[PDB]
C-alpha cells in the first residue's frame with residue numbers, strides 16, 4: 001500500500017478479539033512490536049470503498065487530543081483495516097453503565113468537556129460526525145474520553161442505517177430536520193451532543209427508553225424533549241437543553257457550549 005497513512009499489514013499482529021459491531025470487527029494487537037493498537041476490520045461489502053478510500057485522507061489528517069488517535073490504514077488488501085491507539089477502558093456507554101465506578105458529577109462534566117473540545121475542533125474543520133453517541137466514544141486508561149468513528153456514516157451502504165426511516169438509524173440522537181428532511185449539518189451534531197450529555201448524566205440510560213424508535217421519531221417532531229437527569233443541575237440541564245432548539249439556527253456552536261461548560265466547571 002502506497003500513501004502517507006498506509007500501514008504494512010505485515011507489521012501487525014492480532015492478539016485478542018474486542019468486539020464486532022460498529023462498521024466492523026475489532027481486534028487488539030501490536031504494531032511494529034512496540035505500540036498497542038486496535039484494528040477495525042471493515043466488514044467486506046460494508047460501504048462505498050471507492051468513496052471512503054478517496055475521501056479518507058481528510059479524516060486521517062484530523063489531529064486533536066480528544067479524537068482517538070488514528071495511526072493508519074490498510075487499503076490495498078480487503079478487508080480495509082483502520083488502526084488506532086488502544087483505548088483500555090472501551091466504549092463510553094459500557095464505561096458509564098459499570099456500577100462499580102460510582103461517578104461524581106465532577107467526572108461527568110469532565111467527560112462532557114473532553115467530547116466538546118473534540119467536537120469544537122471538528123466544527124472548525126467543517127467535518128461532521130453524523131453519529132455522535134456514547135456507544136462510539138472511547139475511554140483510555142487515564143479516564144479521558146475521546147471521539148471515535150467520526151464521519152464513517154457517510155459511506156454506509158445499508159439503507160437500514162442510512163435512511164432516517166431506516167431500522168438501524170440513530171433516531172434517538174437525531175433532530176427534527178434529520179428525521180423529517182434528512183438535513184445533516186453542524187447543528188445536527190449539536191443536537192446529538194446534547195443527547196450524549198444526557199447519556200452521561202444518566203449514567204448510560206437509553207434515551208426515550210419507554211418508546212420504540214418509530215414512536216420516538218413520532219414524538220420528537222411534536223416537541224418531546226429529554227427530561228432532566230437526577231444527577232444534572234439546572235445549569236447543566238440548561239446547557240444540554242440549548243442543543244435541542246426546534247429551529248437549527250437557534251442552537252449554539254461547540255465554541256459556545258465549551259464556554260458554558262467551562263463556566264459551570266469554575267463554579268463547581
Ligand SMILES: *[C@@H]([C@H](C#N)C(=O)N1CCC[C@@H](n2nc(-c3ccc(Oc4ccccc4)cc3)c3c(N)ncnc32)C1)C(C)(C)C
Pocket residue numbers: 018019020021026037038039040068070082083084085086087088089090091092093094095134135136138147148149150152
Ligand atoms: C461497547 C463495548 C464494551 N464494553 C466496546 O467498548 N467496544 C465495542 C467493540 C469495539 C471496541 N473498540 N473499537 C475500537 C476502534 C474504533 C474505531 C476505529 O477506527 C476509526 C477511528 C476514528 C474514526 C474513524 C474510524 C478503530 C478502532 C477500539 C479501540 N481503539 N480501543 C479499544 N476498544 C475499541 C469498543 C458497547 C457494545 C457496550 C456500546
Ligand SMILES: [Cl-]
Pocket residue numbers: 101102103104
Ligand atoms: Cl470513578
Ligand SMILES: [Cl-]
Pocket residue numbers: 130153154162
Ligand atoms: Cl448519517
Ligand SMILES: [Cl-]
Pocket residue numbers: 233234235236
Ligand atoms: Cl444549577
Ligand code: NA
Pocket residue numbers: 016028
Ligand atoms: Na489487553
Ligand code: NA
Pocket residue numbers: 063064065066
Ligand atoms: Na489537542
Ligand code: NA
Pocket residue numbers: 101102
Ligand atoms: Na472514583
Ligand code: NA
Pocket residue numbers: 106107108110111143
Ligand atoms: Na472524567
Ligand code: NA
Pocket residue numbers: 130131153170
Ligand atoms: Na448517522
Ligand code: NA
Pocket residue numbers: 177178183184185186187188248
Ligand atoms: Na441539521
Ligand code: NA
Pocket residue numbers: 226227228
Ligand atoms: Na425535567
Ligand code: NA
Pocket residue numbers: 232233234235
Ligand atoms: Na440545580
